[PDB]
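Message: Study each token:
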Amino acid sequence: KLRYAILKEIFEGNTPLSENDIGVTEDQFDDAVNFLKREGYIIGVHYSDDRPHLYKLGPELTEKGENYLKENGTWSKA
């Protein structure tokens, strides 16, 4: 539901981006990033304190993640 939505925000946002800023809670953003990392949609996810933190350079999209945006792109967001 929010998986593509956050991915799209990453894609054009160029990172980093906040959770409240994209429109979700910490744990929602966290779960999304972790899930997307696991399945292989994005890479460059670095853990700091405990949770994933995005920097200004690092989060890279995979072909699968990029292709996913093309299909699930039919979502009114941004």
